[PDB]
């Protein structure tokens, strides 16, 4: 709208631009530095970070360790791959996040070999307990929670993702207070509420609450569930047998794709336009002087 305030020649010339990953607004550098910087006496020994991000209708979770060329992934795990584990609808919720975390844990440590040892907890009773130390035998694999920008509050699915991670074998150090059902008024964890949360108990209770409150909103939501024959008291058991679907075979089988990269290139390049040349530009300028200036 405005060109009276005027981003002038002078102002532009002496403008410093941030970093691209900050100019998008996607990477907190102040945090990132503090996170990734290794204790220099360890040398090349890398620091691994459990990246967890939540888009609208996906969860991304990836262990990354850095290198000055660019930050290299150890392994990745997504929520939209949960279909072949047996969870389809309602897939970016707290329980789903937990599941994703679990998958990433069991995956990375599977591919690193140890898995057999350091199975962690496999009760999932919602108790605050970390990956222990096996006396006589290798240390457990360590990795730190990278949130990025997603704000920290008690109850967030960020923390579900951590819970899933830690329980599934990977050492992520953490305090309890930001898991759901932490009593703020006195240092008293309730594991049973947390327990309920882990298997989508909040969601199931919500479904129960739309029995006689309203049943058009109920139809608006949960449409897929109605289609697939899913209901309240089945829900807690859906995540339960699906956890063992991870703990037998978590091995990452990628999609069949169909077509190859060249085909995709062929598709894409049709729509996006190329640049130009100098000659073409000069011609256009000539046209513009004919039409506007010379006036036919």
């Amino acid at each position: 709208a405005f060109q009276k305030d005027a981003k002038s020649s002078a102002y532009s010339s002496r403008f410093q631009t941030p970093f691209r990953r900050r100019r998008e607004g996607k990477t907190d550098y102040y945090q990132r530095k503090r996170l990734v910087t290794q204790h220099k006496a360890k040398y090349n020994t890398p620091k691994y970070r459990l990246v967890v991000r939540f888009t609208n209708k996906d969860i991304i979770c990836q262990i990354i360790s850095s290198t000055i060329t660019g930050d290299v992934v150890l392994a990745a795990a997504y929520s939209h791959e949960l279909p072949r584990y047996g969870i389809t609808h309602g897939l970016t919720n707290w329980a789903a996040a937990y599941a994703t975390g679990l998958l990433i844990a069991r995956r990375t440590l599977q591919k690193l070999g140890l898995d057999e040892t350091y199975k962690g907890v496999e009760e999932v009773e919602g108790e605050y307990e970390l990956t222990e130390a096996v006396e006589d035998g290798p240390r457990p694999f360590k990795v730190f929670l990278d949130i990025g920008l997603q704000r920290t509050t008690t109850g967030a699915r960020v923390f579900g993702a951590l819970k899933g991670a830690s329980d599934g074998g990977l050492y992520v150090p953490h305090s309890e207070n930001r898991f759901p059902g932490w009593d703020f008024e006195t240092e008293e964890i309730d594991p049973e509420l947390l327990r309920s949360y882990i298997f989508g108990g909040h969601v199931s209770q919500y479904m129960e609450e739309l029995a006689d409150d309203d049943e058009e909103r109920f139809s608006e939501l949960f449409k897929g569930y109605l289609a697939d024959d899913i209901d309240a008291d089945s829900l807690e058991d859906i995540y339960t047998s699906a956890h063992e679907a991870i703990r037998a075979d978590p091995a990452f089988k990628p999609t069949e794709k169909k077509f190859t990269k060249e085909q995709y290139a062929a598709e894409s390049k049709k729509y996006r336009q190329t640049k130009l040349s100098k000659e073409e530009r000069a011609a256009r300028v000539a046209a513009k002087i004919a039409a506007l200036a010379g006036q036919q």
Partner: protein
Amino acid sequence: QNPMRDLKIEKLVLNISVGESGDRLTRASKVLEQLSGQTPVQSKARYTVRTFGIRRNEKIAVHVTVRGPKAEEILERGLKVKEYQLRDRNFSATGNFGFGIDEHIDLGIKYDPSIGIFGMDFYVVMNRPGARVTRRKRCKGTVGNSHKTTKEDTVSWFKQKYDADVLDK
């Protein structure tokens, strides 16, 4: 060429500048409270003046940010004191507007003589859905020129519902 590019009220800020601290301000705070349904906030004087009478950081005025269907209610009944007649100014060049009124009594409120009389400032602020862009934490952005709230467009939107009179020079 108008599917998502719709228009609506984002929020409405009801405000009362009270020339001193303490009693009057507290009474105003009660006033806004029961009108809106939300409990208000109390702003501080940014610097010393003396000619007004106020000084540095004195807790001077009060306001409340109202949103949703609930703001529309108050806009209606309040807009009826000016009687569906605004001005050619009042609408800013950013596609927002406002109208000041006096006597809070003539918009639902009962007098109740311990309270008193206080004039109000309505400043309504507009948007097109998509203005999550600026206010969000992650992946902040600037809103493009074609999707901005202009003055003229806002005036049109106002005319179209409410049967509202723009009027004046």
